[PDB]
Amino acid sequence: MQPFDSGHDDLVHDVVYDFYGRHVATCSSDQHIKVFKLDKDTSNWELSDSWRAHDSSIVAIDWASPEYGRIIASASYDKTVKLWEEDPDQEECSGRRWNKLCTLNDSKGSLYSVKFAPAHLGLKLACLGNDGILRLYDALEPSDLRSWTLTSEMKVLSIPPANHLQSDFCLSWCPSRFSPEKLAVSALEQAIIYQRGKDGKLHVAAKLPGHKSLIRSISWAPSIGRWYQLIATGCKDGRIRIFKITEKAELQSNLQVELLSEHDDHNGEVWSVSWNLTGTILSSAGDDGKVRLWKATYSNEFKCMSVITA
Amino acid sequence: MQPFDSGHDDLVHDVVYDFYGRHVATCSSDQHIKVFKLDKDTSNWELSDSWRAHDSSIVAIDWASPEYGRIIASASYDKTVKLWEEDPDQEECSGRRWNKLCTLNDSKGSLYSVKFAPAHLGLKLACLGNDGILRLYDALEPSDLRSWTLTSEMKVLSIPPANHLQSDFCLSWCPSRFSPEKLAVSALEQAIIYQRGKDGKLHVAAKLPGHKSLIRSISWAPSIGRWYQLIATGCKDGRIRIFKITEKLELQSNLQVELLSEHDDHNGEVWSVSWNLTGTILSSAGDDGKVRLWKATYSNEFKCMSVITAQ
Amino acid sequence: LLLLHRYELFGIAADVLKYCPFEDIMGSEGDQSSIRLFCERCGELITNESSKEKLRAEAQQTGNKKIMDKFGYWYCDSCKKKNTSCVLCERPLKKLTMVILPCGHEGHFQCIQEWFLDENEQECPGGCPGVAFI
Amino acid sequence: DVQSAALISIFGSPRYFRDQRVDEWIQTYRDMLKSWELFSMRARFDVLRSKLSRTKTGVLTADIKPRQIYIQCQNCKQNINT
Ligand SMILES: [Zn+2]
Ligand SMILES: [Zn+2]
Ligand SMILES: [Zn+2]
Ligand SMILES: [Zn+2]
Numbered sequence: 020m021q022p023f024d025s026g027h028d029d030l031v032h033d034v035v036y037d038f039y040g041r042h043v044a045t046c047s048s049d050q051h052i053k054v055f056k057l058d059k060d061t062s063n064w065e066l067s068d069s070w071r072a073h074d075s076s077i078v079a080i081d082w083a084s085p086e087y088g089r090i091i092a093s094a095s096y097d098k099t100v101k102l103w104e105e106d107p108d109q110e111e112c113s114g115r116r117w118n119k120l121c122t123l124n125d126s127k128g129s130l131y132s133v134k135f136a137p138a139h140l141g142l143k144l145a146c147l148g149n150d151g152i153l154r155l156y157d158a159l160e161p162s163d164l165r166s167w168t169l170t171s172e173m174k175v176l177s178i179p180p181a182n183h184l185q186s187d188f189c190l191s192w193c194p195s196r197f198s199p200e201k202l203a204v205s206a207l208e209q210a211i212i213y214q215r216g217k218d219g220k221l222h223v224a225a226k227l228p229g230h231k232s233l234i235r236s237i238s239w240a241p242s243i244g245r246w247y248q249l250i251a252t253g254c255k256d257g258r259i260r261i262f263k264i265t266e267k268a269e270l271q272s273n274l275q276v277e278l279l280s281e282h283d284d285h286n287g288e289v290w291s292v293s294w295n296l297t298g299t300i301l302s303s304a305g306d307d308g309k310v311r312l313w314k315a316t317y318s319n320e321f322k323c324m325s326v327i328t329a
Numbered sequence: 330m331q332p333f334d335s336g337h338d339d340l341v342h343d344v345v346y347d348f349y350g351r352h353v354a355t356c357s358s359d360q361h362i363k364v365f366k367l368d369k370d371t372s373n374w375e376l377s378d379s380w381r382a383h384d385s386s387i388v389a390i391d392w393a394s395p396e397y398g399r400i401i402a403s404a405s406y407d408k409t410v411k412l413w414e415e416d417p418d419q420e421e422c423s424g425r426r427w428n429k430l431c432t433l434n435d436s437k438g439s440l441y442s443v444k445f446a447p448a449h450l451g452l453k454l455a456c457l458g459n460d461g462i463l464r465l466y467d468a469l470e471p472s473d474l475r476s477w478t479l480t481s482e483m484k485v486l487s488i489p490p491a492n493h494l495q496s497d498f499c500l501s502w503c504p505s506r507f508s509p510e511k512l513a514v515s516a517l518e519q520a521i522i523y524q525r526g527k528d529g530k531l532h533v534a535a536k537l538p539g540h541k542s543l544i545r546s547i548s549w550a551p552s553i554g555r556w557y558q559l560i561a562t563g564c565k566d567g568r569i570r571i572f573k574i575t576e577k578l579e580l581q582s583n584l585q586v587e588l589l590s591e592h593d594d595h596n597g598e599v600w601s602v603s604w605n606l607t608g609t610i611l612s613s614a615g616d617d618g619k620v621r622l623w624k625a626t627y628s629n630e631f632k633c634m635s636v637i638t639a640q
Numbered sequence: 641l642l643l644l645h646r647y648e649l650f651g652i653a654a655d656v657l658k659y660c661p662f663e664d665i666m667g668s669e670g671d672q673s674s675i676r677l678f679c680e681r682c683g684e685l686i687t688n689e690s691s692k693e694k695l696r697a698e699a700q701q702t703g704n705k706k707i708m709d710k711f712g713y714w715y716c717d718s719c720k721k722k723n724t725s726c727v728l729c730e731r732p733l734k735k736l737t738m739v740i741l742p743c744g745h746e747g748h749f750q751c752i753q754e755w756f757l758d759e760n761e762q763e764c765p766g767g768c769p770g771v772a773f774i
Numbered sequence: 775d776v777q778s779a780a781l782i783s784i785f786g787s788p789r790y791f792r793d794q795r796v797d798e799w800i801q802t803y804r805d806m807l808k809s810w811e812l813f814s815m816r817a818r819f820d821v822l823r824s825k826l827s828r829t830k831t832g833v834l835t836a837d838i839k840p841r842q843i844y845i846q847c848q849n850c851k852q853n854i855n856t
Contacts, residue, residue, distance in 0.1 A: 038808075038809055039809060039810075039811050040809065040810075085730075085731060085808075086723070086725060086730050086731060086732065087722065087723070087732065088723075088732050141722075142722070158722075159720065160720075161715040161716075161717075161720060161721060161722045161723065162688075162691035162694070162695070162710055162711070162715060162717070163695075163710050196801060197794065197797070197798045197801070242798075242802070243776050243802055244776045244779065244795065244798050244799045244802055296806065296809065297776070297806075348645075348646065349646060349648075350646055350647075472849070553643075606643060606646070672848070675845060675846075676845070676846035677843065677844055677845065677846065678844035678846060678853050679844070680840060680841060680842050680844065683844075683853075685846060724842060727839070727842075728813050728814075728816075728817055729813045730808060730813075739843050743841065744841040744842055744843035744844070744855065745839065745841075745842055745843070746842050746843075751813070754814070755814065755817060759814055761817070761818070761821075763821045764821075765813075765814075765817030765820065765821070766817070766820060766838070766839040767820035767821060767823060767824040767836060767838045767839055768821075768824065768838065768839075769824055769825075769834060
């Protein structure tokens with residue numbers, strides 16, 4: 020383990036890799052976005068740019084597909100999503116290396132999660148805040164990447180939560196070019212899979228059962244070529260639920276969800292859950308201070324292999 | 330650069346460079362065209378290919394512009410002009426490296442001179458031989474190089490001669506890009522300048538006086554910024570005549586021919602004359618095997634600078 | 641200019657010809673290095689009149705002329721094509737290309753030079769049977 | 775092991791039949807090769823897929839990359855690649 024200081028003056032909220040795995044973007048509550056590049060020679064993380072982004076705390080950022088250029092989304096609590104494009108004709112560590120493209124002033128609530136759709140669906144976005152409204156923003160005009168149009172507006176929650184009650188939201192797209200467009204949307208205690216229908220509008224497709232408490236993280240496993248998809252969920256309970264999905268009104272394919280496993284090893288709240296490139300190693304963080312690594316056995320049962328204390 | 334020996338078995342009649350000054354092509358009397366390229370290493374000439382072209386002695390050659398490809402036109406005594414194009418597919422010095430495009434078999438007498446027009450006229454070919462008529466061939470479509478149409482046919486002589494063997498017809502184009510088209514004809518002993526009029530047909534522009542014997546060569550001077558243009562003519566007597574041509578804007582411009590010099594340092598017959606690219610340094614051939622360089626002095630006349638003789 | 645072209649000095653000839661106050665020195669057709677493309681998905685000609693008009697209006701309003709740098713021929717305004725991708729790295733390509741001739745595929749200078757010189761591979765890096773070697 | 779699955783499948787899957795699973799494995803391996811920045815190996819995989827898709831007659835069956843250049847002619851003002 021080699022710890023490197025990101026340099027923020029407050030709590031680092033979200034860290035995301037790029038597609039090539041050599042750039043990391045860190046957002047924080049100090050109203051800053053920092054992009055770190057992995058040097059090939061020194062093999063140490065070094066800062067590329069650090070610029071003020073929002074007027075409130077940034078909680079979710081995402082890299083775009085590398086075939087659409089280098090675009091970083093940024094969803095903060097000031098009801099804005101800002102899209103940032105790199106112009107390489109600027110000096111590093113200056114604040115002008117990443118140029119602003121567009122502000123999405125349509126969300127009436129503090130945004131929690133932002134996600135890009137896979138590259139075969141176009142340059143799409145997915146926003147979710149405490150207003151309970153799922154918004155999809157496309158990029159229709161190819162001449163300028165500043166005219167982003169809202170296309171799908173689906174309501175996840177009937178009424179927004181009060182300010183004193185906590186809430187958490189998370190999103191996960193479907194990394195499958197050979198399956199129709201799917202979207203895993205995590206409400207307060209609900210997990211909904213949304214599928215693109217024949218009419219061009221999203222519809223409710225399946226619901227993941229369980230989840231007696233707040234869902235803290237959702238993650239769709241990469242389809243390496245298997246016939247069943249995997250969704251990993253980390254709840255406010257100690258459960259790392261892994262859902263096995265088999266795909267076969269106005270929907271191109273009906274899909275069935277069966278719970279594959281349920282692990283209580285963390286003894287707390289599973290804050291984050293993630294997947295590998297091939298869907299073989301899961302990583303789960305919890306209140307025990309330990310990050311557990313899960314791999315499937317021969318009998319399709321996930322068993323912990325390493326525990327990393329901190 | 331050092332002198333080199335060709336494989337020709339007879340007399341070389343016309344040697345003409347390409348545009349870029351690295352490809353040279355020699356046409357000879359033993360029915361062979363040998364093309365040599367200047368190698369970058371050691372600055373020596375190397376052979377590219379050697380193919381027989383015609384059934385008689387080839388007396389004229391002229392490269393085309395490199396924008397239209399590596400085109401070589403040869404004129405011989407067989408009343409035909411053939412165009413040849415290089416092929417990088419075939420191996421060097423194999424003999425199949427060059428290919429015919431079109432045979433200009435539209436002549437009754439043996440053709441003497443073939444010359445390529447300036448590039449702002451398109452791909453245009455000038456032919457003049459024993460028939461006493463100047464033939465202009467145009468590429469109306471420069472996309473295909475095997476199509477050639479005769480467009481202008483002007484009778485430069487009043488009558489066909491009797492002693493057809495004792496004749497020499499020479500051509501030279503005018504490299505002025507923005508002047509109207511000017512072509513030089515030396516038919517038997519009279520030198521005629523031809524300008525293109527508003528009717529689209531060639532007309533006699535001006536006549537060079539003098540020329541008491543057969544004009545064996547003619548060369549126009551590239552006028553880089555001068556208000557006057559120069560013509561170098563070479564006669565059978567050995568006299569090199571440099572004419573001064575002033576152009577002032579039925580033709581749309583009149584030409585005033587004024588003789589500027591006449592030199593007889595060649596004790597023989599001036600076969601060829603040439604200009605360098607500045608239009609200043611003039612070189613002349615002769616029957617004595619000597620090469621004389623002529624440069625303009627402080628006055629308006631020209632004087633010899635060196636006599637390059639071969640031993 | 642023809643004397644400069646006779647030697648191997650072409651960049652100097654380009655510098656001379658670019659700022660020449662006489663507008664009809666070499667040729668009268670205007671643009672002879674201009675290349676027009678049809679789209680790879682719809683087949684219409686890439687002229688991009690709508691994008692050029694909108695960017696000209698925007699640059700007229702905002703004053704700065706850097707907005708007109710967004711105009712290009714790497715996108716189609718009729719079929720809404722996003723971008724043209726490199727054949728080796730599949731990244732967006734906007735400013736300079738290196739077209740492989742017999743198959744018609746794009747490429748960065750570094751990508752195409754890497755594949756055709758560093759790797760010593762004689763095939764097109766996009767799955768093409770025609771050997772466009774070297 | 776989608777890498778070995780794809781590199782075995784390309785030895786005669788589109789040459790003899792057509793199933794969606796082989797195309798899924800091929801696309802997944804190509805995306806992984808892009809993610810590891812192995813563009814040269816992706817290109818070698820593409821040319822191997824093109825070479826191993828030659829039928830008995832000789833007709834290629836691989837879904838090759840489509841053309842990106844359609845030059846318009848200066849004189850006739852039409853497509854040079856129709
Ligand atoms: Zn199009
Ligand atoms: Zn590239
Ligand atoms: Zn290709
Ligand atoms: Zn055409």
